[PDB]
Structures are given as structure tokens and as C-alpha cells.
Amino acid sequence: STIAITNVTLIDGLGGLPRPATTVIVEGDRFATVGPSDSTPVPEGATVVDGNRRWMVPGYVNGNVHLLDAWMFMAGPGTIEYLARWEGRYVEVIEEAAQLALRNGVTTVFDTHNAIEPVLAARDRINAGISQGARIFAAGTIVGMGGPFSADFHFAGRTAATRTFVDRIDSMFEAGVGHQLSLLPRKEVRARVRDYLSRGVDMLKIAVSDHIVFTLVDRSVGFDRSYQTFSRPVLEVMVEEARAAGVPVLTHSVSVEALDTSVELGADVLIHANYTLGQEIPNYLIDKIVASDSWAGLQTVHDQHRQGLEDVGSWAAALAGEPYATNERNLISANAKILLNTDAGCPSKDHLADLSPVEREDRPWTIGNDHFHWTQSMVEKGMSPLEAISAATINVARAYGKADQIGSVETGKLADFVLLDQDPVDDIRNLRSITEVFQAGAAVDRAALPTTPLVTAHP
Template identity: 50%
Template sequence: MTTTTLAVVGGTLIDGQGGTPLADAVVLAERGRITAAGRRAEVPVPAGATVIDAQGQYLLPGFMSGNVHLLDGIMMMGKGGAEYLARFEGRLHEVIEEAAQIALRGGCTTVFDTWNALVPVLNARDRINAGRAQGARIFAAGNIIGMGGPFSADFSMQSRAVISSTFADRMDALFDAGVGRWLSTLPPEEVRPIIRDYLARGVDMLKVAVSDHLLGLLGWKSPYLTFSERVLRVIVEETRRAGVPLLTHTLSVESLNLAVEHAADVMIHATITSQHPIPEELMKRIAAGPGWCEIQPTTHDYQCHLDDTNHPWSGYAGGAHEQNTVRMIASGVKIILGTDAGCTDPDILHELPEAELVDRPWTLGDDHVVWMKAMVEKGMTPMNAILACTANVAKAYHQDADYGTLVPGKVADLVVVRADPLADVTNVRKLSAVVKDGVPVDFGKLPLNPMVTKYPRVEDAQRR
């Protein structure tokens, strides 16, 4: 954190509050927090300040992603997951830091990691917070309560056929963290102390699998409820007792209804309901309730590619799920950005067809831009898309006292873009400056020490 005053001068300020943008603005920051934001004529720049010239450009809050898996969760569900974990075992916190740097390179100053290996993600979080590593600020949930590890039925049990049981069990235990699928076999009085102990391990929020994650076995249309009503109630009670946000994983209308009934703070991928339309009565309760919906859309062109190729992921955001998204926007549901994106192995990206790379929603670093593009295509205004990636995320996770808007007192996280994002929301991709904690980031040099994204990996065979 710097003690020098930072001044971002001359840009049009889109401050994250949803009002009219302010032309020729100045934002001042000192000791990592914003001290002033307003018209240039009303906010003098102190002598000796470090100045970022934003003339003719646009200032926005640093983007905040409400749902990532910095160790790539999509890969854990199929091809590439086993080699990824084997290659980087013992250094997973470094992979997470690399992913956090990729997110920061794209202008995301804060990410909420809602499923990951507990010890590595907390290690990376703490190293970044202490300044020992660079990257987007991480808030972490660790495991999803009630889910197994990467080689369980919840992700890629089929990988066990080609890897050692010793390795698979070790990885599952690392991710399971003592709160996996076996909890669903226990009575409430035995679940309570386990959840209480898990919450005491330093997680920033708790995410519960209200429905299962057996997509690899059952597809998009067969989710089961993970816990009994009694056990789910205990999990919710302990989360409230700990004072952290309650997140829900749901894949059906009934599991989504339970999330609403328990007043979840954030309902992850709330539009995914096993290809069943969300009933209008439930939609109205969602809109009227206190919770926020994290939505994972695809762009029109990407969805057409998935549909045309009969891709296994066509049901992810298409069909009834796409209509759920359109209806949520029209109904005024409180929406936040989330993508499930992570640090994908280039070996996996290398074999994808070009049509599957453009607008890929799970590619970290550009995922928030693809999300905004998709949501605007479905009826969201560019301003509301920006709010869904900034202030709304901060509110949903109860972090709005510090983040999400460019107003005095908030942490000085901001981006400067070269073209108007209200004219074309994908202009947020045109970064000229990224500031985190009041310090300009040399974002073009990130990640600093790539392991996953250093490619190709074959060693130079030439003798020296």
C-alpha cells in the first residue's frame, strides 16, 4: 500500500452508483483509499501526486467476480483435471496466485472463489493480502458443503480408472476438507459441530450443495437434494452464527426454492434448473427477496455453436436456462457476475476449435467481458451490466463498505478504459490502467511467474 497520493485525472467517471457519468473527473487516493472524487474544477490535485492521465477515457470501479474457481473447476469435471492436479501438486497455491494475477490483468481486482482446495486457496489469499504475492483480492469458501473431491462422483470419478487410487484419494481429501458428500449420511446433531469447526478454519463465506453435482453421471436433468430439511437448517444456522455470507449451489427448481426460503445471500447459477422454467411465483419471490442471483450466461454466437454441435454443455445456459436469464433481467432480480472461470491448462485450450474459444465463458481474464456482452444481448443495459460486475457483487457479499464504488472512503480499486463502455460494453476490455489498493498495477506483465500458462512445456533439447 502506498502513502503517496494517486490522482486519476480527466476521465469520465462511472462510479458504480448507477447515476449519470461525470465528465472531466478527478479521483484522488491516499493510503489505499479514495479521498475525493468529482469534477476537475472542484478536486485540486496535490503537488507531488502520482498522476494517471485519463483524458478522453473512462474510469470505473475495479471489477469483482462473484464466482470463480481459480483452480479450474470446469476441467475437474472432465478432460485435463487429473494431469493438472498431478503436474502442480504441492504448488497449487502458486497456481491460484497465477490465476489471481490473470484476473487482475483483465481488470478484476477482487474475486470470490466459491469452490477450491481449502488449504491452498487460503494460503494464496493470505499471501496476496499480506503483499507477498500479487493478484486479485481473494475471498474464499473452500469446499462446497456436501460435495466430494475432484475424483468423486461430483466431478470426475471416471478418472480413477487411469490414475492411482493413492493419488485420487489424496486429492479428494485435500478438496473435501472434511465436509464432503458423507455429511449427507449424518443426523443434524452430528453435522452441527462439523460445520462449526469448518467455519472456524478461516473461510470468508460458506457454500452449501442444496442439490447434487452429479452432472457427469446424470446430465443437466437429474439433480437430487443433498440434505434433509433438518440438516440444511443446521447448516444455515451455523453460517448465520458465524456471520459470513451463505451461498447455495442449486440445479433444480426445488433446490432453488429452498435457497430462497433460507434467504441465501448469493444463489449461485440460479438460472440452472434442470431445463425447467422457473415458476412465476418463485421468480417474484426471488425478485422481492434479499438474495442476489449469480447468473452464468453464454453469448448468442457461443450458444449457437454449442447447440449446432450437440455439445454436452449446450444445456448449461441454453434452452429454459436462457429464458430464465431473460426473465430474471426483466423481473428486476438482483444479479451479479459469476462465471466458474479458472486457470485453464493451455493443453485443453489448444485442442478446442476456434468457435469454442471465442466468447468461451470459463476463460479467466476475459470471462467478465464475455459475461457483460451476453447479459446485454439478453436485455440488460450496459450500466446495469457494469453494476453487476462492481457494486452489486460488493453488496451481495457484504463487502460494500470497502469495495464496489468510486466514492470517498472506499478502497481505491479502479480501472481506466480507452472507450465508452456504455456505448459498447465490451470496451471494458480496452484497459489503459488498473489500480488496486491505490497502487497502479503493471498489468501487462502479469502473470509474473507463469507455471500453468507458460507454453509450450517441452524442454529445449539443444545442448549448451
């Protein structure tokens, strides 16, 4: 169809004032003309879309989620069942999460940890309109990290499951890259980091620091025992390669140091720079990130979500309060360039059942809720009700080099948009009320989504 959406009150999300009396046309995919005129106008064959009493915000863009849920895998009881159920139809399961986002208005997602052949499949099944879902740029595995049954993720179950299964699934995820590279000389690293890269992942996440946490973490004490995965020399050896392909660089930082190094490594996208596992980002580095110009994603929680979570002693609750949010504001109020990151996904129905109602009410990490929560809380961090959005908008997409394409709302750009019911401003939570989601200049049947309920099957 060729469509005209009329009488929209438009948030470009660029940061400009919202403008009412705005009428947007779509050509093909592709936004066409943006102006009010009275209209613009309509080419008589153009499909009508009535935009009275609604808003257009650019289609939401999530910079961090895992289409197959690693927060659970990291979480981790229930990793084994969810992998064994759903094995071999994973690629359709990945497309499940991709839909839940889009259903909630996220047109495009960046996934930083997954199984590469199913997540590439998914990225291929979705773009070609074989499979309904959100546009996915595949991160691949995160380099230097082991499988779902390794450490880095839930470690027991190495002993509770058949060895042949436990390794089987790992090799899917780990591919030829990953954590054994610790030991070995960069020569062979260099070798195996482009054989991998040649696989078509959009991006590279270089795991600069350890993923061993729930495994080691202490039952009274909070965090400790951060480590550093790779040699400082070995670390450029993958940045050179990453630079060579044209994929940008994403980085796992978990400690004040290794964040520093990640900033010195010139990494395009910093994934959870706010979790420094410790002291707040030394008031030094903020003015290096800010100064040395690479984008910074923060992952957040409400106070109200936290207030509950320590009330129930969630132990994933420590991350919410405590030096971590008292640390982001500095970057916010220092105008660090900010990204939408909630490590996220679509968990097994049983793992929701274990959590307290307090805990799974409005859970940030659940892929439908995540971008709303994040946009709601960030303001709680001293952020105007805009930018907030984009925020999710341009800033995740400015930070990958997808900015010219997504999105949007501007002429000659992919037409991905969401229509709201109510003012996004003073109440940032209105992003939830969505009369329509358009993608690639196309309508989404939101009412019936997902296309095939799989991981939402109970019983």
C-alpha cells in the same frame, strides 16, 4: 505513492449518469476526494496520473470463479495431469488465476469451490502484497460435495489413477466437510460444520443439490436426475452456523426445487439460480426471490457463442440456449437483484487444444474472458449497457456485505479501479480496452503479469 487521476469521465457504476470533468484523488489506498473542481486539487507531491481520453469504471468484481479450475475438473478429461503437475505448488497456481483476472481488470474475486489450505494461503499471500493478484475471498469447498476424483466432478480417473493419489488430493479439497455428511445425523454435521468454519473461509456454499452431472448425463438426451443432498432440517443446521460466524450464505441450486428451498433458507447469495435443469423458474418463485430479497447470480452465454457451440455439439452447449436464458430475462425484467457469476478459472493448455476453435474462441469460462463475456451477454438479455457493470460492481459486493469496502468509486473506499480506452455505452465490450488497473490505491504492472507463468507453460 499518493496519486491524482485527472480529467476522468467517471462511471461510479452506482447507476448514476456518467459524469465527465471528474478528478479523483487517492489517499493511501482509499479514494480520497471525488469532484471535478477544475481539479481538486493536487497536493504538489502527489503522483500525477493523466486521465484524459479515458474512463474510470469501478474495479471489476467477480462473484464466481474457481482459482483452480473446476469447470475442467468437471469437464473433466485433463483433471488428472493438471493436478499431478502443479501438486504442492497449487497455492502459486491459484495465484495464477487471481492475476489473470486483475490483468483483465478484476480487482476482487469470490471463489466458490477450491482446496481450502491452498486457497486460504492464496488469499493470505495476495492481501499482504507478498503475491501479486486479485483480492480473493475464499469460499472453501462447497459443503456436501466430493473431490475432483469423486463424482460431482470427473468420476472416471477414479479408476485411471493410483488410489493413494486419488484420495490424497480429494481430502485436500473435501476437508472435513463435504459429501459424506449426507448419511450422518445433523448433530455431528453441526459439529463438523463449525470446526470447518473456524478455518477462516469468508463464506459458505451449502450444496443443496447434486453435483453428479457429466458422470450421469445422457449421450442423446439432455439433463435429468436432479437430487437433493441434505435434509431440510440438516440444511438450517448449517445456516445457523454460517449465521453464527458472520460469513454469508451461498448456495448451489440446480433444480427449480432446492432453489425454492434455497430461497426459503434465506441464502444471501444464490449461485446459478438460472440453471434449474429443466423448466424455467416457475412464474411464482421469481416473485419470491424478488419478494424475499436475496441476491441472484446468473451465468450466461452469447447467442453467438451458443450458435457455434451447438454447431459443434459441445454437450456443455445445452446450458447456453434452451430454457436457461429464456428464464433469466424474467428475473432481469422482474428486477431480481443480480450478481456476476461465471463458474470459471484457468484450464490446462491441453484442454483448450481439444476444443474447436469455434468453442475456445471467446470462451466464457476462461478467467480472463469471463467477466467481459458475461457483461456483453447480459445486455443480450435486455439489460441496459449499464447497469451491466455493477452488475459486476456493487451488486456482487452489495450481496456479500463487502459493499462499504468495494468497489468503488467513492470517498473512503478501497481504491480499486480500471481505466478504459473507449465508451462503455452502446458498446459494453469496451471494458476490454484498459490503459491501467489500479488496486488498493496502487498501480499494477499489467504488461508483466502473471508474476510466474505456471499453468500457461507449454511446452
